[PDB]
Design a protein around this ligand. Structure first.
Ligand code: HEM
Ligand code: HEM
Ligand code: HEM
Lengths: 678, 677, 309
């Protein structure tokens, strides 16, 4: 159990009497009053201690990535990696380390929808035996800006307008596109966020990246440049925008519920930790600067080397105490890892420590159970708000005769201390500049765009079209088109259509036809369909329900999550049509007989909104899902103009339908149903 | 060990490598720099996590009683008190309950002197098996004001002036005496503070009081009005003002060190917990209203019943984590105790809960190790800053089918829940008034003053003379005299001499000659002299030191703490003359031979300030201490004009001197050395 | 008036009726009760708004230099110093700039005595027309330690023992002298604190020092190394220890009252601002490194040059 160490702070209230926070059994359902219909007394200490605690429950949300959810798990090293790093969690084959991971969006406040379009956070803590080591990453390998000092500028621009606080969790507004076009570094991350990476199917279907180049350091002090990757074993998958929008309203908790359910059902998700490793002398060798976080290193120049595997297999017991309170920091580093002079990373080191002072209202947040390391804390720090320990050493300073030199200094040679890469040097003038090697903001967005399938490219074009059309200022729209044109004239032209503007003439400076592997989502089938959801549309009349039970039983034996839907909660029904929506499912199947709810009187119950069963099948089809109908239920497919012969559409007997649906779920989205320009 | 439950949060760093606060071994003595003589890097995470924790060390001091010290101990019940109270900790003979007690002044900030003149706090927590019970009391049985809404006024007035933040830890300024005279209720507590209670010898030598009338309540709901008393087993003792002032400078930590040392030396202090119990129907029968916290109940009318004993026998391990962070509340009440309609107490209930939000910056301060009960916390409270637990019950509400009714309601009949006294009633109009039963502000101050010895009375008088003479506004001084005159024309006249004013003509309204036992200090000799301090003035020349060592050994066998003083730290010398002051000691003895440092060049070594030895003996004598000189050292006494025949002055052979000093220490202060008007 | 800008936030209560903090006139000397001798009512909003504000009056004291006092004033430049610095407040003869200065001890908490033996703070803010400029200085020109990472160690060692919190406002205890002897860089500041600088007669009788070498930079980007000095026009004066101890008990407020009274009586204190100027190529010319804050620069090598008052 990855949560084992947290057991000593767990509190069980079953079989107990109610108490105050200072002990003493009480009742707390009536205010103390002066007379039968009298005023409440100030001396009601019970009322005040209960309401005070309630009045003070909230803490500030994260300044970014406020909306998210997480889980505990175990990382297992596949090897002794001492030849590349001194890091203890990677020091032996099969070595296990507890982890906690939180996934998130970026812009939205705490109750905003999971399926907003946004960059996503993918933050991992390794509770190693040499300190907490955090890889605070995203589901996208590049970031918007090149110097951390511009972070408040980027974030102010994407978050709601400060006059009216509109719009929630969206970049589809004037200020965001003003910034993206005024600060062209942002274009690469923008293209990723406008692709499937912006609207992923689940946290479990995301890759993760540390983005920055870091250093791995061996005991002897030799270093290699490194990029961290998390490769999902569930495969990458994404929604379509028109679906993501409805899902935002039908279930704002889609991703947090997905993760929660997969873990409770014994379908713990896994990722492999992989690295790209290059020599220090390769920093500027690949057509860009490895200190520049707006570029990624194509796998063709440095392949992924898999180091181990992380599996998330325990949900938290209390979301607030665990998920909400956990405090990640890129500054949480251990012996065997070091920073690079990435100007974005450099500033992060400051920001994450500092911001905890606001979020936790004090300096002792590392003492919180979810934040505590497993490896022991020994230093001369004392006092501070909420100090939870009692220190035995009264000689709380170094150097000192009186404490006999304890706690002692550790370094590269003694006590496995942290050490900065010994060969790192500084040279030149102090400067408030960036290197000219950072200047190409256009080649890699083009590389990314080139490496998507034609329909994936259309999705990127259509996301930009949707978003940019919300921009009220004409000149900002023109600015956006000018910047897009430096990446691809075709992209600019196709976006300009939606905006009713003329794209600038081609500017070939940065155009190219190069492609790189592994950045596409829809181009590869899923390696497993376990946990994928099948909505089975049935009815309470006749024999549909019994056949739906049989369909469900078969699908579930093959790892699927099945919801039987009907007009009311009859035996064997999981959900009502009133409560159902296509956004909740990965595949939609009409059980035989259920065709009666697609036309005629069966479609007109006061138990569900008009057209509801037809709408679910319609949404399912148009959003590219596998859709199907058993036997006479083909009439339902016919009712919405969908033909049996189409890809991702299945009819016939339960056996043909099950096999076809399961094969379609590997494809996941049928992209032939989406129109492409021309 | 009273601190037993705290062991699990204790952190031993011996034999360990330095780490960050998130684990990982480090060095932290050099900032990471860009080049040999280069600038410090922002990426030095080690530097920033260390300095950030340092930068954020301080928390707000207590809004009052900021300056204080505490210790852990055990309370033991002398009986099964179930016939008067359902309170568990009083429920059986020999039953033991861990305590923590903090003593304090009132006005001063965190670093102000222990021996400022002030009311003193005496706050006790019982970590009972039915919740934390706090008796948050003072060393004086009455308070300045009659309604809690007036607390900020009182407190603003005694604390430093808000333009210049002067004076520290003192009521000797215009605004305080303006308040004392504008709000006559304040006069009773004022008199106590101007007596020995304002400058106690140590925390161990104070009595304590709950001040308010509370209620004890039996299981069947029967109630008694109750006053809490703590009776020191060390005896009451006090300083004189001219001594307290020097001590405030020589050792601001005099009381906290005294408590620390007594406990470390195995001389744990004790107090007996005692109560006066009053029938509800007699709340207004003793010449005042028992809901009025500016009055005490003379023990002649209601003697003390002794419930048990508490002994403070463990010092904290970390002062900040334990003493500074502990959060007392009069709202910390348990089954078997209830409140009364004392308007002062009523408002405190709100104020102590609220103030913790400032001091601890969040709502989970009861989760700090020093604040946690030992009896277990089960409720539907969740979240808040610093939430340190992980709650298992996901159905965090009541009533509920899903949680099977747990945590469950407790009341008078089920689960030993708290219950308000059955039969307490309300009656009459909602009002912003005070009963007219509260209106007599002068009779008890007069009763108090009547009950002091003549020299103790002079002490009160001289304290008012000293304080009132600092008042710059002439009319405020006149206002003060007018109020004092309502208490006693003699007091007013005697104070008026110092102020160069004419005391008003007698106003006989409130004058009386009644007296009450037990409010005095200097009249009764001490029950023990253990822990008391003897300073032995010696010299590195000749054989004086060897004789000092023998003196020291005899005295120590008898339980005294002895400091042998000389020009420098030779073998057997505990303190240099440069480091020594008479304020540190309860008695001063000149060893034979040391008379050499009391005149001539012997009295002016570069090793101490000129006259230092004579000053110590002189101070010790003028402040009323036992002083002594062995053999030829009586020359020291002669040099300062002190005669061997005087009370509290002992000369002769060692045996004789030791016997004498030990008897004098019991008397503690020799009051005949202080002139009376 | 140096405090002129603060006038708009000053609140006058003369002749006014009592109110809550949200307005509305009130009385606030009696709690609202249920009956004549009754319990206080939760609905007494007046009682709670008043006590809540009282309950929350305190803020944390400064982690160091907690005990201190200050005053407002005016700095006047004696010249146009554009040839040594671009700094606006030094840019013209007779140019005036408002200041505020806080003097302090170091170790003691807020209520501790003025006349404890300690290093003293001397922090000046110039409210210049190009931003606030602070010289956060001490009355001793050198500091105990050479690297800021060691500050918690220094300060823990001189502050009270963490078990009993003894002694207040004093270095006269084991941990301090353990640190001074374990970290010999501390010896220079120690000697100054053991001299009259440790027990000055008044704030008005102290010199002040920026301690560190800073740079003055002209418009063209050329720089000079600089040491900041404040020279008291009242002269330096000190107590003797045995006197300082008694005074700590007799008047803890000796220094803050001295400054207050001097200003109130029209005897405003003055300090001349003076600098030592050093060419960049002479950083290591004088027997030590000017980047090292545990050494000062002898006036024989670089005379004090007065810039203003
Ligand atoms: C490669 C670039 C970046 C990545 C991969 C990244 C990723 C993340 C993630 C995943 C979180 C949420 C952690 C959680 O789940 O609690 C987060 C939060 C945060 N980020 Fe970053 N971010 C980046 C850039 C920056 C920069 C440049 C700054 C500031 C200079 C910054 C400041 C913050 C702050 C203050 C938080 C809130 C932390 C907290 O309240 O605990 N981020 N970031
Ligand atoms: C019988 C009258 C009173 C007594 C015996 C008394 C006693 C005490 C004591 C001993 C302390 C210090 C507790 C400790 O050592 O930490 C204290 C603190 C305090 N008192 Fe009282 N006091 C009285 C009146 C009041 C009133 C009327 C109020 C407000 C309505 C009040 C508000 C406070 C507050 C806010 C604190 C700070 C507590 C903390 O920060 O933990 N006191 N009092
Ligand atoms: C040349 C060395 C130093 C000098 C001259 C100096 C001077 C001062 C002065 C005068 C103050 C009080 C300002 C006031 O009146 O409010 C102060 C406060 C302070 N000092 Fe320093 N100090 C020095 C070294 C350090 C170092 C090395 C650190 C930490 C790296 C430090 C951290 C602080 C902090 C945190 C405060 C509290 C400031 C506040 O709360 O507003 N000091 N120092």
């Amino acid at each position: 159990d990855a949560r084992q160490r947290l057991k000593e702070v767990e509190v069980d209230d079953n079989g107990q009497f109610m108490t105050t926070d200072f002990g003493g059994n009480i009742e707390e359902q009536f205010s103390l009053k002066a007379g039968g219909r009298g005023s409440t007394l100030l001396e009601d200490f019970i009322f005040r201690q209960k309401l005070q605690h309630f009045d003070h429950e909230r803490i500030p949300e994260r300044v970014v990535h406020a909306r998210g959810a997480g889980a505990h798990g175990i990382f297992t090293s596949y090897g002794d990696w001492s030849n590349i790093t001194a890091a203890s969690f990677l020091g032996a084959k099969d070595k296990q380390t507890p982890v906690f991971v939180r996934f998130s969006t970026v812009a939205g406040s705490r109750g905003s929808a999971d399926t907003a379009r946004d960059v996503h956070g993918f933050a991992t803590r390794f509770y190693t035996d040499e300190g907490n080591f955090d890889i605070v990453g995203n589901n996208i390998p590049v970031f918007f800006i090149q110097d951390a000092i511009r972070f408040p500028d980027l974030i102010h621009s994407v978050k709601p307008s400060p006059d009216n606080e509109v719009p929630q969790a969206a970049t589809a507004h004037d200020s965001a596109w003003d910034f993206f076009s005024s600060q062209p570094s942002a274009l690469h991350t923008l293209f990723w966020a406008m692709s499937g990476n912006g609207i992923p199917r689940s946290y479990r279907h995301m890759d993760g990246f540390g983005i920055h180049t870091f250093r791995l350091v061996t005991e002897d002090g030799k270093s290699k440049l490194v990029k961290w990757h998390w490769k999902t074993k569930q495969g990458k998958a994404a929604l379509v925008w028109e679906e993501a929008q409805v899902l935002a309203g039908k279930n704002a908790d889609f991703h947090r519920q997905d993760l929660w359910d997969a873990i409770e059902s014994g379908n713990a998700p896994s990722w492999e930790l992989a690295v790209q490793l290059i020599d220090e002398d390769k920093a500027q060798a690949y057509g860009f600067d490895l200190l520049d976080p707006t570029k990624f290193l194509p796998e063709e120049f440095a392949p992924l080397q898999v180091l181990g595997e992380m599996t998330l297999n325990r949900n938290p017991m209390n979301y607030f105490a665990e998920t909400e309170q956990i405090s990640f920091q890129p500054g949480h580093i251990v012996r065997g890892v070091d920073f690079t002079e990435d100007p974005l990373l450099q500033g992060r080191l400051y920001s994450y420590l500092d911001t905890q002072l606001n979020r936790h209202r004090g300096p002792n947040f590392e003492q919180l159970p979810i934040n505590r390391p497993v490896s022991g804390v020994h230093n001369n720090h004392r006092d501070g708000q909420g100090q939870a320990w009692i220190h035995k050493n009264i000689h709380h300073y170094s150097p000192s005769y009186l404490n006999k030199g304890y706690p002692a200094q550790a370094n590269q040679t003694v006590g496995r201390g942290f050490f900065t890469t010994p060969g790192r040097t500084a040279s030149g003038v102090l400067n408030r500049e960036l290197s000219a090697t950072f200047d190409d903001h256009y080649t890699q967005p083009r590389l990314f765009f080139n490496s998507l399938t034609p329909v994936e490219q259309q999705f990127v074009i259509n996301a930009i079209r949707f978003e940019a059309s919300h921009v009220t200022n004409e000149q900002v729209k023109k600015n956006v088109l000018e910047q897009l044109n430096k990446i691809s004239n075709d992209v600019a032209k196709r976006v300009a259509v939606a905006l009713g503007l003329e794209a600038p003439q081609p500017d070939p400076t940065y155009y190219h036809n190069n492609v790189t592997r592994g950045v596409s989502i829809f181009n590869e089938s899923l390696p497993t369909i376990a946990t994928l959801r099948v909505g089975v549309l049935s009815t309470t009349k006749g024999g549909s329900l019994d056949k739906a039970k049989a369909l469900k039983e078969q699908l579930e034996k093959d790892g699927l999550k099945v919801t039987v839907i009907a007009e009311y909660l009859a035996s064997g029904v999981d959900q009502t049509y009133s409560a159902a929506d296509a956004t909740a499912f990965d595949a939609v199947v009409v059980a035989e007989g259920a065709e009666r709810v697609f036309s005629g009187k069966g479609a007109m119950s006061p138990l569900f909104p008009a057209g509801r069963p037809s709408q679910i099948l319609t949404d399912g089809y148009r959003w590219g899902k596998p859709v199907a109908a058993v036997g006479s239920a083909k009439k339902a497919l016919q009712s919405i103009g969908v033909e049996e012969k189409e890809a991702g559409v299945y009819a016939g007997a339960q056996d043909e339908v099950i096999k076809g649906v399961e094969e379609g779920l590997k494809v996941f989205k049928f992209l032939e149903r989406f129109a492409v320009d021309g």
